[PDB]
Amino acid sequence: TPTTFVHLFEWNWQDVAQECEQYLGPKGYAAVQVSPPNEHITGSQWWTRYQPVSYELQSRGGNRAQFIDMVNRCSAAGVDIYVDTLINHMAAGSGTGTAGNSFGNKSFPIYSPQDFHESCTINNSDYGNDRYRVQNCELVGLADLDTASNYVQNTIAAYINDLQAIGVKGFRFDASKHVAASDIQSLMAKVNGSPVVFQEVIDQGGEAVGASEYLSTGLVTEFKYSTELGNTFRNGSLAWLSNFGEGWGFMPSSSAVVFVDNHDNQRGHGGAGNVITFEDGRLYDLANVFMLAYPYGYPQVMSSYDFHGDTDAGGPNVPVHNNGNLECFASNWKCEHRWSYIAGGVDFRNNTADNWAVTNWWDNTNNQISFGRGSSGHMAINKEDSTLTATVQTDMASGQYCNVLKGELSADAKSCSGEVITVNSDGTINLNIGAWDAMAIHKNAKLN
Ligand SMILES: [Ca+2]
């Protein structure tokens, strides 16, 4: 059952189309969030993608034809496409777009100086006590579109309706905090049907504009999850997560889009150092295993590239698929969605989606937790410096199960590629997990 989606940051349409057929489809990913496909400014920095010139599908990821080929090829594989949409602004200053268009002085090929809000600057303090300035002034200098204008709302909605016709099935509304929820509701009245849409709102609390103001127009990104999960795994006790979710002040599970990190907060935008990324290796594995196993939110697995510190640097200068050679796990693309632990976690979630309850919770009161998803699956994480050799109780049928985190079940279901977990006649399991490791089993990965 589809339950997870991945974000292939800066991946071009070619790589995404291939990745769909070769891995994403077969593994179980529901869909893919792609980088803005519309025309943007020229430059190698990743953030150039967030400075639109027009809405013609000519970006750094490829052209219209290529984009279309990508949507189609993924659909056949069983993978939807989510398009990161810019609804709050347009490029800044003056220049040229990736499709050859010119712009300058709030004058684009499809917008005039009158289609924008009068120029003013958004200040750090404005977020706390001035929703007006937050949604009407310029964010980092980006021309702020007049989202209340019928003309503006029509051109954006036309862009969205085109991508739907092409087959896009979801949308990410970027910088939704900088756009009045009222304007978003108007926009959606012009959008055909009801495509999956989630809004990027960064609300850690104490802000003029609350995340809750958008629960009505679609899902919302819950940044608390990220910083809290990271902070717990780094400086707290995993035993605290027993009631993670609404109990910690988080928005409703069925409204939240959670994740361990994203392209922003992994660069210091929306999260401090406590956030966990691919650079933390095994820590990232464990953290991801928790997220995918825990029945809260719609998980967004991250797929990034090593930027060697430079937070402005763009993606690698080599495709993920280099003449039959996969450029992953090294100094270019990290392809975390392919890491055994993370993919294994995706598998767990997919086969336990028929029991969104956390059962038989157990913990050593500190950094060894364990719980199940009813008789559909069970997991355990050991973050201590000694082996977890405790006997836990499960609701799973006795037998031999594959630890889907370290391997998978064979075709004939008569073997596992990784280690085998045993559930005794009484439904218990005599754990045997080394320091900083984990296990996870489900009903669709049973032997013989
Ligand atoms: Ca705005």
mmCIF file of N, CA, C and O in Angstrom, residues 357-427:
data_model
loop_
_atom_site.group_PDB
_atom_site.id
_atom_site.type_symbol
_atom_site.label_atom_id
_atom_site.label_comp_id
_atom_site.label_asym_id
_atom_site.label_seq_id
_atom_site.Cartn_x
_atom_site.Cartn_y
_atom_site.Cartn_z
ATOM 1 N N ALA A 357 -2.188 1.680 14.452
ATOM 2 C CA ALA A 357 -2.040 1.765 15.896
ATOM 3 C C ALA A 357 -0.663 1.306 16.358
ATOM 4 O O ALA A 357 -0.020 0.476 15.718
ATOM 5 N N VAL A 358 -0.208 1.867 17.468
ATOM 6 C CA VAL A 358 1.075 1.495 18.050
ATOM 7 C C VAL A 358 0.698 0.540 19.183
ATOM 8 O O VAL A 358 0.008 0.932 20.118
ATOM 9 N N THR A 359 1.134 -0.711 19.102
ATOM 10 C CA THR A 359 0.803 -1.673 20.145
ATOM 11 C C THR A 359 2.023 -2.176 20.899
ATOM 12 O O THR A 359 3.154 -2.078 20.419
ATOM 13 N N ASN A 360 1.772 -2.734 22.081
ATOM 14 C CA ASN A 360 2.824 -3.293 22.922
ATOM 15 C C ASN A 360 4.103 -2.460 22.929
ATOM 16 O O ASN A 360 5.162 -2.936 22.520
ATOM 17 N N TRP A 361 4.007 -1.219 23.382
ATOM 18 C CA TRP A 361 5.182 -0.371 23.438
ATOM 19 C C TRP A 361 6.061 -0.851 24.578
ATOM 20 O O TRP A 361 5.568 -1.294 25.619
ATOM 21 N N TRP A 362 7.368 -0.776 24.362
ATOM 22 C CA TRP A 362 8.345 -1.196 25.349
ATOM 23 C C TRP A 362 9.586 -0.342 25.192
ATOM 24 O O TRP A 362 9.959 0.020 24.078
ATOM 25 N N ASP A 363 10.216 -0.008 26.312
ATOM 26 C CA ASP A 363 11.458 0.762 26.290
ATOM 27 C C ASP A 363 12.235 0.504 27.579
ATOM 28 O O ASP A 363 11.654 0.112 28.588
ATOM 29 N N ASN A 364 13.552 0.680 27.508
ATOM 30 C CA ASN A 364 14.442 0.476 28.639
ATOM 31 C C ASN A 364 14.499 1.769 29.448
ATOM 32 O O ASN A 364 15.410 1.972 30.252
ATOM 33 N N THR A 365 13.518 2.637 29.210
ATOM 34 C CA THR A 365 13.394 3.931 29.875
ATOM 35 C C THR A 365 14.389 4.938 29.314
ATOM 36 O O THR A 365 14.392 6.099 29.704
ATOM 37 N N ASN A 366 15.243 4.504 28.400
ATOM 38 C CA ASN A 366 16.199 5.432 27.822
ATOM 39 C C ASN A 366 16.303 5.338 26.299
ATOM 40 O O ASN A 366 15.448 5.858 25.584
ATOM 41 N N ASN A 367 17.332 4.660 25.797
ATOM 42 C CA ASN A 367 17.496 4.580 24.353
ATOM 43 C C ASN A 367 17.310 3.241 23.630
ATOM 44 O O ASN A 367 17.987 2.955 22.640
ATOM 45 N N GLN A 368 16.379 2.432 24.127
ATOM 46 C CA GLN A 368 16.038 1.155 23.505
ATOM 47 C C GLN A 368 14.518 1.103 23.514
ATOM 48 O O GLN A 368 13.902 0.959 24.565
ATOM 49 N N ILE A 369 13.909 1.244 22.348
ATOM 50 C CA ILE A 369 12.467 1.217 22.280
ATOM 51 C C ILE A 369 12.049 0.027 21.443
ATOM 52 O O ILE A 369 12.885 -0.608 20.797
ATOM 53 N N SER A 370 10.753 -0.264 21.462
ATOM 54 C CA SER A 370 10.181 -1.369 20.696
ATOM 55 C C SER A 370 8.667 -1.253 20.684
ATOM 56 O O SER A 370 8.062 -0.901 21.690
ATOM 57 N N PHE A 371 8.054 -1.543 19.545
ATOM 58 C CA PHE A 371 6.607 -1.496 19.454
ATOM 59 C C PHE A 371 6.181 -2.150 18.157
ATOM 60 O O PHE A 371 7.005 -2.415 17.283
ATOM 61 N N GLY A 372 4.889 -2.421 18.038
ATOM 62 C CA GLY A 372 4.403 -3.045 16.831
ATOM 63 C C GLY A 372 3.214 -2.328 16.230
ATOM 64 O O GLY A 372 2.748 -1.303 16.732
ATOM 65 N N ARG A 373 2.725 -2.883 15.132
ATOM 66 C CA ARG A 373 1.579 -2.343 14.430
ATOM 67 C C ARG A 373 0.561 -3.484 14.397
ATOM 68 O O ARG A 373 0.126 -3.936 13.337
ATOM 69 N N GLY A 374 0.199 -3.950 15.587
ATOM 70 C CA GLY A 374 -0.736 -5.050 15.690
ATOM 71 C C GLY A 374 -0.110 -6.308 15.116
ATOM 72 O O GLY A 374 1.107 -6.472 15.152
ATOM 73 N N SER A 375 -0.929 -7.203 14.581
ATOM 74 C CA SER A 375 -0.397 -8.415 14.008
ATOM 75 C C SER A 375 0.147 -8.211 12.597
ATOM 76 O O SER A 375 0.368 -9.173 11.872
ATOM 77 N N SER A 376 0.369 -6.966 12.198
ATOM 78 C CA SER A 376 0.909 -6.716 10.866
ATOM 79 C C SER A 376 2.428 -6.589 10.892
ATOM 80 O O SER A 376 3.105 -6.955 9.933
ATOM 81 N N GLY A 377 2.973 -6.069 11.980
ATOM 82 C CA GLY A 377 4.414 -5.952 12.044
ATOM 83 C C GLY A 377 4.944 -5.555 13.400
ATOM 84 O O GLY A 377 4.190 -5.154 14.283
ATOM 85 N N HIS A 378 6.251 -5.684 13.572
ATOM 86 C CA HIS A 378 6.887 -5.303 14.819
ATOM 87 C C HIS A 378 8.295 -4.777 14.519
ATOM 88 O O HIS A 378 8.916 -5.179 13.531
ATOM 89 N N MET A 379 8.782 -3.872 15.370
ATOM 90 C CA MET A 379 10.101 -3.283 15.204
ATOM 91 C C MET A 379 10.773 -3.028 16.548
ATOM 92 O O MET A 379 10.168 -3.231 17.608
ATOM 93 N N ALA A 380 12.034 -2.599 16.493
ATOM 94 C CA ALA A 380 12.820 -2.306 17.684
ATOM 95 C C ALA A 380 14.075 -1.564 17.272
ATOM 96 O O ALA A 380 14.647 -1.858 16.233
ATOM 97 N N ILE A 381 14.494 -0.600 18.086
ATOM 98 C CA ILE A 381 15.696 0.181 17.810
ATOM 99 C C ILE A 381 16.577 0.205 19.052
ATOM 100 O O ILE A 381 16.093 0.439 20.151
ATOM 101 N N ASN A 382 17.868 -0.049 18.874
ATOM 102 C CA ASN A 382 18.803 -0.015 19.993
ATOM 103 C C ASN A 382 19.823 1.097 19.794
ATOM 104 O O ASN A 382 20.678 1.002 18.912
ATOM 105 N N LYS A 383 19.738 2.146 20.614
ATOM 106 C CA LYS A 383 20.675 3.269 20.516
ATOM 107 C C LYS A 383 21.575 3.399 21.737
ATOM 108 O O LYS A 383 22.068 4.485 22.035
ATOM 109 N N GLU A 384 21.781 2.289 22.440
ATOM 110 C CA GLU A 384 22.659 2.258 23.607
ATOM 111 C C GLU A 384 24.019 1.742 23.138
ATOM 112 O O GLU A 384 24.232 1.566 21.944
ATOM 113 N N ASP A 385 24.932 1.486 24.070
ATOM 114 C CA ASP A 385 26.264 0.989 23.725
ATOM 115 C C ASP A 385 26.412 -0.492 24.019
ATOM 116 O O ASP A 385 27.518 -1.024 23.999
ATOM 117 N N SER A 386 25.288 -1.141 24.297
ATOM 118 C CA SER A 386 25.263 -2.557 24.602
ATOM 119 C C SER A 386 24.110 -3.232 23.858
ATOM 120 O O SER A 386 23.125 -2.582 23.485
ATOM 121 N N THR A 387 24.245 -4.537 23.646
ATOM 122 C CA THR A 387 23.246 -5.332 22.936
ATOM 123 C C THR A 387 21.883 -5.298 23.636
ATOM 124 O O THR A 387 21.799 -5.325 24.863
ATOM 125 N N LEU A 388 20.824 -5.219 22.832
ATOM 126 C CA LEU A 388 19.449 -5.223 23.318
ATOM 127 C C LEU A 388 19.083 -6.694 23.258
ATOM 128 O O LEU A 388 18.839 -7.234 22.178
ATOM 129 N N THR A 389 19.062 -7.346 24.412
ATOM 130 C CA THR A 389 18.764 -8.763 24.456
ATOM 131 C C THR A 389 17.518 -9.042 25.277
ATOM 132 O O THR A 389 17.388 -10.102 25.906
ATOM 133 N N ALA A 390 16.589 -8.091 25.247
ATOM 134 C CA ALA A 390 15.333 -8.218 25.990
ATOM 135 C C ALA A 390 14.288 -9.001 25.218
ATOM 136 O O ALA A 390 14.330 -9.062 23.993
ATOM 137 N N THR A 391 13.360 -9.613 25.946
ATOM 138 C CA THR A 391 12.276 -10.393 25.345
ATOM 139 C C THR A 391 11.041 -9.491 25.226
ATOM 140 O O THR A 391 10.443 -9.120 26.230
ATOM 141 N N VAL A 392 10.666 -9.123 24.008
ATOM 142 C CA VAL A 392 9.498 -8.266 23.813
ATOM 143 C C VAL A 392 8.287 -9.120 23.468
ATOM 144 O O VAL A 392 8.424 -10.265 23.039
ATOM 145 N N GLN A 393 7.103 -8.549 23.638
ATOM 146 C CA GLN A 393 5.867 -9.250 23.325
ATOM 147 C C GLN A 393 5.279 -8.682 22.031
ATOM 148 O O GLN A 393 5.217 -7.464 21.870
ATOM 149 N N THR A 394 4.871 -9.548 21.102
ATOM 150 C CA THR A 394 4.264 -9.072 19.857
ATOM 151 C C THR A 394 2.889 -9.709 19.643
ATOM 152 O O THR A 394 2.447 -10.536 20.437
ATOM 153 N N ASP A 395 2.225 -9.304 18.566
ATOM 154 C CA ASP A 395 0.902 -9.808 18.219
ATOM 155 C C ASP A 395 1.007 -10.518 16.888
ATOM 156 O O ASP A 395 0.007 -10.738 16.200
ATOM 157 N N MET A 396 2.231 -10.885 16.532
ATOM 158 C CA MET A 396 2.479 -11.554 15.267
ATOM 159 C C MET A 396 2.441 -13.073 15.353
ATOM 160 O O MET A 396 2.760 -13.654 16.384
ATOM 161 N N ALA A 397 2.025 -13.706 14.261
ATOM 162 C CA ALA A 397 1.940 -15.160 14.181
ATOM 163 C C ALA A 397 3.345 -15.737 14.279
ATOM 164 O O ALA A 397 4.277 -15.217 13.663
ATOM 165 N N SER A 398 3.506 -16.808 15.047
ATOM 166 C CA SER A 398 4.825 -17.425 15.198
ATOM 167 C C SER A 398 5.398 -17.842 13.848
ATOM 168 O O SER A 398 4.656 -18.133 12.907
ATOM 169 N N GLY A 399 6.726 -17.871 13.762
ATOM 170 C CA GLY A 399 7.382 -18.258 12.528
ATOM 171 C C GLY A 399 8.722 -17.585 12.323
ATOM 172 O O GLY A 399 9.273 -16.986 13.244
ATOM 173 N N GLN A 400 9.246 -17.701 11.109
ATOM 174 C CA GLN A 400 10.518 -17.102 10.755
ATOM 175 C C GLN A 400 10.241 -15.905 9.876
ATOM 176 O O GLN A 400 9.575 -16.027 8.852
ATOM 177 N N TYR A 401 10.763 -14.749 10.268
ATOM 178 C CA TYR A 401 10.551 -13.530 9.507
ATOM 179 C C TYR A 401 11.871 -12.919 9.058
ATOM 180 O O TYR A 401 12.903 -13.105 9.704
ATOM 181 N N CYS A 402 11.843 -12.189 7.947
ATOM 182 C CA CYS A 402 13.052 -11.530 7.453
ATOM 183 C C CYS A 402 13.137 -10.131 8.049
ATOM 184 O O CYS A 402 12.145 -9.415 8.087
ATOM 185 N N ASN A 403 14.323 -9.738 8.490
ATOM 186 C CA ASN A 403 14.533 -8.390 9.009
ATOM 187 C C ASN A 403 14.630 -7.547 7.726
ATOM 188 O O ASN A 403 15.706 -7.433 7.135
ATOM 189 N N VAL A 404 13.506 -6.978 7.290
ATOM 190 C CA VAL A 404 13.462 -6.194 6.052
ATOM 191 C C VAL A 404 14.383 -4.988 5.996
ATOM 192 O O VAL A 404 14.487 -4.326 4.968
ATOM 193 N N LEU A 405 15.050 -4.712 7.104
ATOM 194 C CA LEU A 405 15.969 -3.592 7.184
ATOM 195 C C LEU A 405 17.343 -3.996 6.644
ATOM 196 O O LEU A 405 18.070 -3.167 6.086
ATOM 197 N N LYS A 406 17.682 -5.276 6.807
ATOM 198 C CA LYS A 406 18.966 -5.815 6.359
ATOM 199 C C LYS A 406 18.849 -6.757 5.171
ATOM 200 O O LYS A 406 19.838 -7.346 4.746
ATOM 201 N N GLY A 407 17.647 -6.897 4.633
ATOM 202 C CA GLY A 407 17.470 -7.768 3.492
ATOM 203 C C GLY A 407 16.020 -7.883 3.073
ATOM 204 O O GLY A 407 15.177 -7.102 3.519
ATOM 205 N N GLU A 408 15.723 -8.854 2.215
ATOM 206 C CA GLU A 408 14.360 -9.058 1.757
ATOM 207 C C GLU A 408 14.043 -10.519 1.504
ATOM 208 O O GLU A 408 14.929 -11.373 1.493
ATOM 209 N N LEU A 409 12.754 -10.798 1.339
ATOM 210 C CA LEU A 409 12.279 -12.156 1.114
ATOM 211 C C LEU A 409 12.390 -12.593 -0.350
ATOM 212 O O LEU A 409 12.162 -11.809 -1.275
ATOM 213 N N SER A 410 12.733 -13.859 -0.558
ATOM 214 C CA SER A 410 12.880 -14.379 -1.906
ATOM 215 C C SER A 410 11.542 -14.540 -2.615
ATOM 216 O O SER A 410 10.477 -14.437 -2.003
ATOM 217 N N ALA A 411 11.613 -14.799 -3.916
ATOM 218 C CA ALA A 411 10.424 -14.979 -4.728
ATOM 219 C C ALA A 411 9.541 -16.066 -4.125
ATOM 220 O O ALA A 411 8.393 -15.815 -3.773
ATOM 221 N N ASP A 412 10.094 -17.267 -3.996
ATOM 222 C CA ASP A 412 9.369 -18.397 -3.438
ATOM 223 C C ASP A 412 9.178 -18.276 -1.942
ATOM 224 O O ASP A 412 8.659 -19.190 -1.308
ATOM 225 N N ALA A 413 9.609 -17.159 -1.369
ATOM 226 C CA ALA A 413 9.462 -16.954 0.063
ATOM 227 C C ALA A 413 10.056 -18.097 0.893
ATOM 228 O O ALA A 413 9.479 -18.506 1.901
ATOM 229 N N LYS A 414 11.203 -18.615 0.470
ATOM 230 C CA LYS A 414 11.851 -19.690 1.208
ATOM 231 C C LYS A 414 13.207 -19.261 1.766
ATOM 232 O O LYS A 414 13.978 -20.085 2.259
ATOM 233 N N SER A 415 13.490 -17.966 1.705
ATOM 234 C CA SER A 415 14.746 -17.464 2.220
ATOM 235 C C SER A 415 14.746 -15.952 2.334
ATOM 236 O O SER A 415 13.875 -15.285 1.791
ATOM 237 N N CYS A 416 15.734 -15.429 3.052
ATOM 238 C CA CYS A 416 15.895 -14.000 3.255
ATOM 239 C C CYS A 416 17.306 -13.670 2.807
ATOM 240 O O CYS A 416 18.185 -14.534 2.839
ATOM 241 N N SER A 417 17.540 -12.429 2.396
ATOM 242 C CA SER A 417 18.880 -12.041 1.995
ATOM 243 C C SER A 417 19.657 -11.563 3.230
ATOM 244 O O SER A 417 20.882 -11.636 3.263
ATOM 245 N N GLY A 418 18.927 -11.094 4.243
ATOM 246 C CA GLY A 418 19.545 -10.627 5.473
ATOM 247 C C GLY A 418 19.331 -11.600 6.622
ATOM 248 O O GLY A 418 19.145 -12.794 6.393
ATOM 249 N N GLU A 419 19.345 -11.099 7.858
ATOM 250 C CA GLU A 419 19.157 -11.965 9.032
ATOM 251 C C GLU A 419 17.686 -12.332 9.236
ATOM 252 O O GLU A 419 16.795 -11.626 8.778
ATOM 253 N N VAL A 420 17.440 -13.438 9.923
ATOM 254 C CA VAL A 420 16.077 -13.907 10.176
ATOM 255 C C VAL A 420 15.633 -13.698 11.644
ATOM 256 O O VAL A 420 16.374 -13.988 12.588
ATOM 257 N N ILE A 421 14.425 -13.177 11.836
ATOM 258 C CA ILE A 421 13.910 -12.961 13.183
ATOM 259 C C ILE A 421 12.909 -14.068 13.482
ATOM 260 O O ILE A 421 12.160 -14.513 12.611
ATOM 261 N N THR A 422 12.897 -14.517 14.721
ATOM 262 C CA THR A 422 11.998 -15.584 15.098
ATOM 263 C C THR A 422 10.988 -15.101 16.133
ATOM 264 O O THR A 422 11.334 -14.432 17.110
ATOM 265 N N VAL A 423 9.732 -15.445 15.917
ATOM 266 C CA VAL A 423 8.702 -15.092 16.862
ATOM 267 C C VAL A 423 8.294 -16.441 17.402
ATOM 268 O O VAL A 423 7.906 -17.324 16.639
ATOM 269 N N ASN A 424 8.423 -16.606 18.714
ATOM 270 C CA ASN A 424 8.103 -17.871 19.374
ATOM 271 C C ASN A 424 6.612 -18.159 19.408
ATOM 272 O O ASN A 424 5.805 -17.319 19.039
ATOM 273 N N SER A 425 6.252 -19.352 19.858
ATOM 274 C CA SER A 425 4.854 -19.742 19.935
ATOM 275 C C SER A 425 3.994 -18.767 20.741
ATOM 276 O O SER A 425 2.808 -18.622 20.471
ATOM 277 N N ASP A 426 4.583 -18.098 21.726
ATOM 278 C CA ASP A 426 3.821 -17.166 22.556
ATOM 279 C C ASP A 426 3.798 -15.743 22.009
ATOM 280 O O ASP A 426 3.388 -14.818 22.704
ATOM 281 N N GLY A 427 4.258 -15.557 20.776
ATOM 282 C CA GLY A 427 4.250 -14.226 20.186
ATOM 283 C C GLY A 427 5.370 -13.293 20.631
ATOM 284 O O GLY A 427 5.402 -12.125 20.249
#
